[PDB]
Amino acid sequence: DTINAKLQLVMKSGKYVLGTQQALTTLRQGRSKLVVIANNCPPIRRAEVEYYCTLSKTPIHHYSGNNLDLGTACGKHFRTCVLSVTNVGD
Amino acid sequence: AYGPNVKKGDLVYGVVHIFASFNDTFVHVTDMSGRETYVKVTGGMKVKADRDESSPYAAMMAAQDVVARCKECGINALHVKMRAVGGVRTKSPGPGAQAALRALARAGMKIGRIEDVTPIPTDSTRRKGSRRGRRL
Amino acid sequence: GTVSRPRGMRPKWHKKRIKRLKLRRRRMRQRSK
Amino acid sequence: GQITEGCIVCNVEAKPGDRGTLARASGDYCIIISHNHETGRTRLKLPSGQKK
């Protein structure tokens, strides 16, 4: 429950992007603090995102929930595969 | 003279199973594994009427027949196992349980250890009769 | 031994009689209609 | 011989190398009952309810 508790704090005071393309953009720009990935995700896409995170030395977290569960826990009404935090105020 | 090779005063042990219900009584002598049978005499083999099969007298008569044939076998001392019907039925022994044991001792046989072996269920299937029971 | 004086006949059997009567009436009305 | 007892299987060959002859119709299966290592034989319960 700790990650669900922290994500709401980020949504209150922070900045983020949703989606693989925007997450990779923030990783290339080196303006990202944490990446979160859902448990159902194609292995190729998961492998690419983790490769970028390793190469950039960025903390990465496995959500253990569905992409629908991650989308709900984000306060949104749509499914999300990847979340990228670019500013955390808490 | 089919006994084993032992001294004249040695004790050779067997096991007797005494099954005494309220309709009959069994006197059954085996070895310590229960696989070989020496003699088996019942109370219905000594009386002529059905109502007398469970009498203490019928049980005593059956026991004396067992002792006579055991001398041929070569058996001298008998361990005793006793039981009632058990299961989901009654757990109390029949009238001939005590008479059979006493007759064996008084006939010259040595008595070893005694144990009750009535079947006892940890949990059980429903018994006969209705929920109202037997109505007399 | 556990009950007072009923009148008529055991009430459960009386109810069973009435039940059979109603079934027969239902069948007769069904045949006519 | 490598499948643990109690497992549910399909497409079973009665003789080795026949490429599958038992439990093939839709929704059907066999149950593995026991192994015997001395004789190298496995016991199965078939869809019909027979043992083989």
């Binding site: - | 084993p4 090779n5 310590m32 594994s33 076998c73 250890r113 009750d116 072996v117 | - | -």
Partner: protein, 225 residues
């Protein structure tokens, strides 16, 4: 004639027991293809522990030991431990009306490949100055006692052979250790091993059986009159 065909044999216990030849049995003589040895193997013999150990401690008189025949050697039957049980009269006299009865089942594997199942029974007791009418135990303590017993038995019995494990079950060696270590959790009136049974055995090994039996006494059943 029934007794024309019968030959006498002797049943021998393993070397853990002071009385080796403890029972006598009969069998058919070999006729044609019916060999007497193959029907003799596999039989189970029951005996009282007090008789085998030739003691009068009043605690061994309520235990029975069973042995299974594994090989025939002339007119001697070589056996191995099968199971041990407390007699029914003793077990039924330990139950009390206003206390808690706790039971545990433990499965352990020895070093020789033998698998055993153990059944343990324990009873609560009231303290010296207690005035309460009952002595029921709380469920949390009962579960804790069950967990400790399972840990202790699985640790001691997984490092010994089938012969040493039998030696521990007899002489009440394992029982005293359990009572001493379980009293701090709960005041125990009595703790007993009600039954121990072998549920799996390894493959037959002729040399292993001979080592367990040590020096085998001779039989005189075939000797000339």
């Amino acid at each position: 004639e029934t007794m024309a065909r019968k030959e006498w044999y002797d049943v021998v216990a393993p070397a853990n027991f002071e009385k080796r030849q403890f029972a006598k049995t009969i069998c058919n003589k070999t006729q044609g293809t019916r060999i007497a040895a193959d029907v003799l193997r596999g039989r189970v013999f029951e005996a009282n522990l007090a008789d085998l150990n030739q003691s009068a401690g009043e605690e061994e008189a309520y235990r029975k030991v069973r042995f299974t025949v594994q090989e025939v050697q002339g007119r001697n039957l070589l056996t191995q431990f099968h199971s041990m049980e407390v007699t029914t009269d003793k077990m039924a006299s330990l139950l009390r009306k206003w206390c808690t009865t706790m039971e545990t089942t433990v499965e352990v594997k020895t070093a020789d490949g033998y698998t055993m199942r153990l059944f343990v029974v324990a009873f609560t007791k009231p303290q010296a100055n207690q005035q309460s009418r009952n002595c029921y135990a709380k469920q949390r303590l009962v579960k804790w006692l069950r967990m400790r017993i399972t840990k202790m038995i699985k640790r001691r019995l997984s490092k010994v052979q089938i012969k040493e494990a039998v030696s521990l079950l007899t002489r009440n060696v394992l029982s005293d250790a359990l009572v001493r270590r379980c009293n701090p959790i709960l005041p125990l009136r009595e703790l007993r091993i009600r039954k121990v049974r072998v549920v799996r055995t390894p493959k037959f090994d002729a040399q292993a059986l001979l080592s367990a039996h040590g020096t085998i006494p001779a039989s005189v059943e075939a000797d000339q009159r």
